[PDB]
Design an enzyme around this catalytic site. Structure first.
Site, PDB file in Angstrom:
ATOM      1  N   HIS A  88      -2.297  -4.285 -14.329  1.00  0.00           N
ATOM      2  CA  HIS A  88      -1.526  -4.546 -13.123  1.00  0.00           C
ATOM      3  C   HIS A  88      -2.431  -4.479 -11.902  1.00  0.00           C
ATOM      4  CE1 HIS A  88      -1.307  -0.730 -10.853  1.00  0.00           C
ATOM      5  NE2 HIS A  88      -1.513  -0.169 -12.032  1.00  0.00           N
ATOM      6  N   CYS A  89      -1.992  -5.149 -10.837  1.00  0.00           N
ATOM      7  CA  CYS A  89      -2.566  -4.978  -9.509  1.00  0.00           C
ATOM      8  C   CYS A  89      -1.422  -4.875  -8.509  1.00  0.00           C
ATOM      9  CB  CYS A  89      -3.519  -6.121  -9.156  1.00  0.00           C
ATOM     10  SG  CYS A  89      -2.906  -7.747  -9.433  1.00  0.00           S
ATOM     11  N   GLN A  90      -1.215  -5.915  -7.703  1.00  0.00           N
ATOM     12  CA  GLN A  90      -0.110  -5.926  -6.749  1.00  0.00           C
ATOM     13  C   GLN A  90       0.676  -7.230  -6.810  1.00  0.00           C
ATOM     14  OE1 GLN A  90      -2.880  -4.702  -3.273  1.00  0.00           O
ATOM     15  NE2 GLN A  90      -1.019  -3.495  -2.932  1.00  0.00           N
ATOM     16  N   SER A  96      -5.024  -9.130 -11.676  1.00  0.00           N
ATOM     17  CA  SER A  96      -4.711  -8.816 -13.065  1.00  0.00           C
ATOM     18  C   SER A  96      -4.527 -10.078 -13.895  1.00  0.00           C
ATOM     19  CB  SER A  96      -3.456  -7.946 -13.137  1.00  0.00           C
ATOM     20  OG  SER A  96      -2.534  -8.283 -12.116  1.00  0.00           O
TER      21      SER A  96
END
Ligand code: CJA
EC number: 3.1.3.16
Length: 148
Positions: A88-90, A96
């Site tokens: 995950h990232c944002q 990601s």
């Protein structure tokens, strides 16, 4: 709170998806890759998951290719022991998604665009960033001139 399954053991999400512990355990996820410099390793002190941070920004100068090999090893560690991995990232999942696509290109033998089309079908909202796209193009060549 969607944790998008890409492979049966590989999931993609944003910052809010990575905060749903009950969905993580339902899906037998024991590995987490946090592809940000600033977000916390959610659920760290709970002692439930193995963590790896790829301290990357969503910019036009961020090098993500440097993290591909390290990330692939963490994915195969989860796969070889029968556990799921969340990356995950944002919001926009630009960082990601790049790593997920890179993994599919190497161990699913897909082309860059085929992997991108495969991921977009499952998570339709992917924010673009041309800098990462170029790194995946260079990655495609390094693959086509090597083993597996
Ligand atoms: C490997 S992406 C790719 S290949 C061919 C196309 C594209 C594409 N991608 C995106 S978003 C995803 C990204 O840019 C990442 C952050 C994951 C690198 N928007 C538009 C397009 C146009 C057509």
């Amino acid at each position: 709170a969607e944790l998008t399954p890409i492979l049966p053991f590989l999931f993609l999400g944003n910052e809010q998806d990575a905060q749903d512990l009950d969905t993580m355990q339902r899906l037998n996820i024991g590995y987490v890759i946090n592809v940000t410099t600033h977000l916390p390793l959610y659920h760290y002190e709970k002692g439930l998951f193995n963590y790896k941070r790829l301290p990357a920004t969503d910019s036009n100068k961020q090098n993500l290719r440097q993290y591909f090999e390290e990330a692939f090893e963490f994915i195969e560690e989860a796969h070889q022991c029968g556990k799921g991995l969340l990356i995950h990232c944002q919001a926009g999942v630009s960082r990601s998604a790049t790593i997920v696509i890179a993994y599919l290109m190497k161990h699913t033998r897909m082309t860059m665009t085929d992997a991108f089309k495969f991921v977009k079908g499952k998570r339709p909202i992917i924010s673009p960033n041309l800098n990462f796209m170029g790194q995946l193009l260079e990655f495609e060549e390094d693959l086509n001139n090597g083993v597996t």
